[PDB]
């Protein structure tokens, strides 16, 4: 009963944030070049490392 709801939620969550990139000026931006964040997370640090 939870698998389907989680799948739909993940699908739409991905559809929202599908195109966001860390541009070379260190600003997360969307496809239309509308700057959503001026620095990722406030520090520009990838949580992976």
């Amino acid at each position: 009963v939870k698998t389907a709801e989680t799948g739909y939620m993940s699908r739409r969550l991905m559809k929202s944030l599908e195109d966001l990139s860390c541009q070379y000026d260190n600003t997360v931006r969307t496809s239309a070049n509308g700057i959503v964040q001026f620095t990722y997370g406030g520090d520009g640090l990838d949580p992976l490392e």
């Binding site: 070049n33 509308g34 700057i35």
Partner: protein
């Protein structure tokens, strides 16, 4: 009776303090002792003989400071007046706007008591040179900027906005906009196209600046 009148007096005092700090941090001239007004002083100087809230005396006029008038060349004096009739309609709003026009004021803040007739709202945004704003007395009890979840907003002038746009090589249509009539926007009274810099504090990143524009 006694309890209702005293409660209204205290609420009006808190609203007046909120109005004073709102017109202070916008760049106008008030003294810290004037905003920090004890309730006893409010009763003494802003009440009648039998102790009722009279708003005809607490209305005031504020003028800019030297540093704020240097940063913003186009910023005239403002006239903050309250209302006596709860259901503010077309007639009282029309009298207020006529007074604003004849008094040569760049802006005016009308703190209505309980309710605003939609016709008054229709008449509100029709003045080319100046402008007027509406604030509910209930909406002004604790100023929004002092809430824990409201980060520090700063109004940026034309030169600062130009510097920011050149620094980030952006345009006025790309920054993350903030709606007009936003409770922290109409508090500062940002006009359309004014950039506000936000000192946002996060536990994992300290303080950092995020920019918005009024649309």
């Amino acid at each position: 009776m006694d309890q209702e009148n005293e409660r209204n007096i205290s609420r009006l005092w808190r609203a007046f303090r909120t109005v004073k700090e709102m017109v202070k941090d916008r760049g106008y001239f008030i003294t810290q002792e004037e905003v920090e007004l004890p309730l006893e002083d409010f009763k003494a100087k802003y009440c009648d003989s039998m102790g009722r809230p009279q708003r005809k005396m607490m209305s005031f006029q504020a003028n800019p400071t030297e540093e704020s008038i240097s940063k913003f060349p186009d910023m005239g004096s403002l006239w903050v007046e309250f209302c006596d009739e709860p259901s503010v309609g077309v007639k009282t709003m029309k009298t207020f706007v006529i007074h604003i026009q004849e008094k040569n004021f760049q802006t005016g803040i009308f703190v209505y008591q309980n309710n605003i007739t939609p016709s008054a709202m229709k008449l509100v945004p029709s003045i080319p040179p100046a402008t007027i704003e509406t604030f509910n007395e209930a909406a002004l009890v604790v100023n929004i900027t002092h809430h824990e979840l409201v980060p520090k907003h700063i109004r940026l002038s034309s030169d600062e906005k130009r510097e920011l746009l050149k620094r980030y090589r952006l345009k006025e249509s790309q920054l993350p906009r903030i709606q007009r009539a936003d409770p922290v926007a109409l508090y500062l009274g940002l006009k359309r196209g004014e950039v506000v810099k936000i000192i946002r504090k996060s536990e994992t990143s300290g303080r950092y600046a995020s920019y918005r524009i009024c649309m």
